[PDB]
Write a protein that holds these residues in place. Structure first.
Motif, PDB file in Angstrom:
ATOM      1  N   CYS A  41       0.853  -1.204  -0.145  1.00 49.80           N
ATOM      2  CA  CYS A  41      -0.310  -0.005  -0.021  1.00 49.80           C
ATOM      3  C   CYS A  41       0.617   1.199  -0.289  1.00 49.80           C
ATOM      4  N   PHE A  42       0.716   2.037  -1.223  1.00 54.98           N
ATOM      5  CA  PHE A  42       1.794   3.752  -0.682  1.00 54.98           C
ATOM      6  C   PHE A  42       0.997   4.274  -1.137  1.00 54.98           C
ATOM      7  N   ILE A  43       1.234   5.154   0.456  1.00 57.64           N
ATOM      8  CA  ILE A  43       0.916   6.952   0.098  1.00 57.64           C
ATOM      9  C   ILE A  43       1.799   7.526  -1.003  1.00 57.64           C
ATOM     10  N   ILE A  44       1.071   8.202  -1.744  1.00 59.21           N
ATOM     11  CA  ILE A  44       1.893   9.124  -2.655  1.00 59.21           C
ATOM     12  C   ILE A  44       1.602  10.627  -2.951  1.00 59.21           C
ATOM     13  N   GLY A  45       1.074  11.221  -1.490  1.00 58.22           N
ATOM     14  CA  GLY A  45       0.983  12.250  -1.578  1.00 58.22           C
ATOM     15  C   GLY A  45      -0.335  13.062  -0.763  1.00 58.22           C
ATOM     16  N   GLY A  46      -1.212  14.083  -1.026  1.00 62.91           N
ATOM     17  CA  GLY A  46       0.501  14.947  -0.262  1.00 62.91           C
ATOM     18  C   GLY A  46       0.230  15.248   0.348  1.00 62.91           C
ATOM     19  N   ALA A  47       1.047  16.501   1.241  1.00 64.42           N
ATOM     20  CA  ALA A  47       1.438  16.708   2.098  1.00 64.42           C
ATOM     21  C   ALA A  47       0.868  17.283   3.784  1.00 64.42           C
ATOM     22  N   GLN A  48      -0.804  16.644   3.444  1.00 63.21           N
ATOM     23  CA  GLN A  48      -1.684  16.509   5.360  1.00 63.21           C
ATOM     24  C   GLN A  48      -1.480  15.156   4.245  1.00 63.21           C
ATOM     25  N   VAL A  49      -1.883  14.603   3.603  1.00 65.31           N
ATOM     26  CA  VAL A  49      -1.793  12.989   4.120  1.00 65.31           C
ATOM     27  C   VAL A  49      -1.094  12.382   4.774  1.00 65.31           C
ATOM     28  N   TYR A  50       0.640  12.910   4.331  1.00 66.48           N
ATOM     29  CA  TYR A  50       1.259  12.077   5.160  1.00 66.48           C
ATOM     30  C   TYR A  50       1.853  12.427   6.382  1.00 66.48           C
ATOM     31  N   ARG A  51       1.554  13.591   6.494  1.00 68.80           N
ATOM     32  CA  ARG A  51       1.854  13.680   8.294  1.00 68.80           C
ATOM     33  C   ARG A  51       0.610  13.268   8.433  1.00 68.80           C
ATOM     34  N   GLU A  52      -0.489  13.281   8.574  1.00 68.08           N
ATOM     35  CA  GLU A  52      -1.383  12.309   9.356  1.00 68.08           C
ATOM     36  C   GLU A  52      -0.805  11.102   9.742  1.00 68.08           C
ATOM     37  N   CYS A  53      -0.529  10.345   8.334  1.00 67.69           N
ATOM     38  CA  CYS A  53       0.241   8.273   8.504  1.00 67.69           C
ATOM     39  C   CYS A  53       1.249   8.783   9.639  1.00 67.69           C
ATOM     40  N   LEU A  54       2.070  10.035   9.380  1.00 67.76           N
ATOM     41  CA  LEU A  54       3.335   9.685   9.538  1.00 67.76           C
ATOM     42  C   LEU A  54       2.485  10.318  11.344  1.00 67.76           C
TER      43      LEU A  54
END
Ligand SMILES: NC(=O)C1=CN([C@@H]2O[C@H](COP(=O)(O)OP(=O)(O)OC[C@H]3O[C@@H](n4cnc5c(N)ncnc54)[C@H](OP(=O)(O)O)[C@@H]3O)[C@@H](O)[C@H]2O)C=CC1
Ligand SMILES: CCc1nc(N)nc(N)c1-c1ccccc1
Length: 215
Positions: free
Chosen positions: A147-160
């Motif tokens: 399962c790849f998270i490919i963006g953007g910024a807000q999606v990266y944040r929440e997941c990290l």
């Protein structure tokens, strides 16, 4: 249990150096993170980079029928205690940023995170989810490889922030460019570099491919 491991949730992105400004309480000329440029005006800060686009496509597309079973057993297992393709997850902005002659991303199960979009609106074949919670529900009852998270910024944040990232494929665009979107900060002690590729030259600009894995 580590949901990022159980459902193989990875992150893939590309970042360049940020170009200075002239007035703003945001210009971070001495940021500890040299490569943090993610986007500019709804687009990638740089121009069509074929070397990275090829990379991104090979990584997000690749599946290994063999190694699936072991993944299948792992999930089947975790579940009780409670065609093969990868999944790609993107935020609405990123989704809208992608030209139509590319959506949905082929050879991959497309998922868009949004609270506004609806099936009547979007005519492409993609799952629409309204939260990471719903993303887990979907993954829980879906057959996929990685399962790849490919963006953007807000999606990266929440997941990290939820520690839902098992690995991060980070491309380093050796070039400075204007940017209004940056890669979210995260505790770098929980990760370690496991792959550092050789250097590449795309029309003069250099770039490399780093891979971080959860500790
Ligand atoms: N260099 C790289 O590797 C990448 C660069 N980019 C660039 O990044 C910029 C876009 O990033 P950014 O503006 O942060 O946008 P995102 O792509 O993260 O999309 C933001 C939108 O995604 C939705 N969303 C985010 N989190 C959730 C959630 N938890 N639940 C439901 N919906 C959610 C919302 O949609 P809604 O408002 O409909 O609810 C939201 O407003 C662009 O310039 C793009 O080109 C993007 C990916 C990768
Ligand atoms: C090809 C650019 C690219 N390169 C890398 N390394 N990671 C990414 N996540 C993307 C990307 C950006 C926006 C939308 C889809 C994919």
């Amino acid at each position: 249990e580590n949901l990022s491991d159980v459902f193989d949730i990875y992150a893939i992105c590309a970042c360049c150096k940020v170009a200075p400004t002239s007035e703003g309480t945001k210009n971070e000329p001495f940021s500890p993170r040299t490569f943090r440029g993610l986007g500019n005006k709804g687009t990638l800060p740089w121009k069509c980079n074929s070397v990275d686009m090829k990379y991104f496509r090979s990584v997000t597309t690749y599946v290994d029928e063999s190694k699936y079973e072991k993944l299948k057993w792992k999930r089947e297992r975790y579940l009780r205690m409670e065609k093969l393709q990868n999944v790609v997850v993107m935020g609405r902005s990123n989704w809208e940023s992608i030209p139509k002659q590319y959506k949905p991303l082929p050879n991959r199960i497309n998922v868009v995170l949004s609270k506004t979009l609806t099936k009547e609106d979007v005519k492409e074949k993609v799952f629409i989810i309204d939260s990471i919670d719903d993303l887990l529900l979907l993954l829980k009852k879906l057959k996929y490889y990685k399962c790849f998270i490919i963006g953007g910024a807000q999606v990266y944040r929440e997941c990290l922030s939820r520690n839902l990232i098992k690995q991060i494929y980070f491309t380093r665009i050796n070039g400075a460019y204007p940017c209004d979107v940056f890669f979210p900060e995260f505790d770098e002690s929980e990760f370690r570099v496991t792959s550092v590729s050789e250097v590449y030259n795309s029309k003069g600009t250099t770039l490399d491919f780093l891979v971080y894995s959860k500790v």
